[PDB]
């Protein structure tokens, strides 16, 4: 399975033709972290005139892409992350998302691989 990082999913919602083509070619389950769903929901009404469009497009994505609930297994992976890599305030959200990828043995698709290089055992697809 793949877990799309938030920025990748934003590019999907907002119609970036390059990301959309690449995502179409991925094999197996395409998943979203619920943390990413929270981030995507916050952007819907950013630009008022585009609100209805982003609403509809995100709602269509959430009909298809399973959203991973943040569970004890993800928090266990989070604890192992900070145990081995050390604490980082800036990367809490990023690591919660990566922890869900770890918990599901999923490949994490991202534009920001640099911030996830310190996470041991994370399968990464860096775009």
């Amino acid at each position: 399975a793949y877990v799309l990082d938030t920025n990748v999913a934003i590019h999907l919602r907002d119609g970036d033709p390059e990301v959309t083509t690449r995502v179409t070619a991925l094999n197996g389950a395409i998943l979203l972290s619920i943390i990413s769903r929270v981030e995507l929901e916050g952007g819907v009404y950013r630009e008022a005139a585009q609100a209805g469009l982003r609403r509809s497009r995100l709602d269509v994505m959430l009909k298809v892409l399973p959203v991973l609930d943040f569970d004890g297994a993800a928090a266990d992976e989070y604890r192992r992350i900070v145990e081995s890599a050390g604490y980082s305030r800036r990367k809490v959200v990023d690591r919660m998302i990566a922890a869900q990828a770890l918990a599901h043995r999923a490949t994490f698709v991202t534009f920001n691989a640099d911030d996830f290089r310190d996470i041991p055992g994370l399968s990464l697809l860096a775009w």
Binding site: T6, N7, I10, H11, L12, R13, D14, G15, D16, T20, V23, T24, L26, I30, E39, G42, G43, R46, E47, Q50, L53, R54, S56, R57, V60, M61, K63, V64, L65
Partner: protein, 70 residues
């Protein structure tokens, strides 16, 4: 494309419809069912990433891709 007539029946005393070969969907394929008045419609659920992208591509694009606000 194909037409048939028939009645429902009880399978496990839930109501069911028999589908001849020229109307069947094949096994293990998950279906969506919607009843509105006189009409029942049944079709395979479109749950692949390619269906999602097809749907998104039929809809207007926003004027820009948002910034992630990290």
């Amino acid at each position: 494309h194909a037409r048939a007539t028939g009645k429902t029946f009880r399978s496990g005393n839930s109501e069911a419809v028999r589908l001849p070969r020229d109307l069947a969907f094949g096994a293990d394929v998950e279906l969506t069912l919607i009843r509105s008045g006189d009409v029942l419609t049944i079709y395979p659920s479109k749950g692949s990433i390619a269906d999602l992208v097809a749907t998104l591509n039929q809809m207007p694009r926003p004027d820009s891709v948002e910034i992630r606000d990290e």
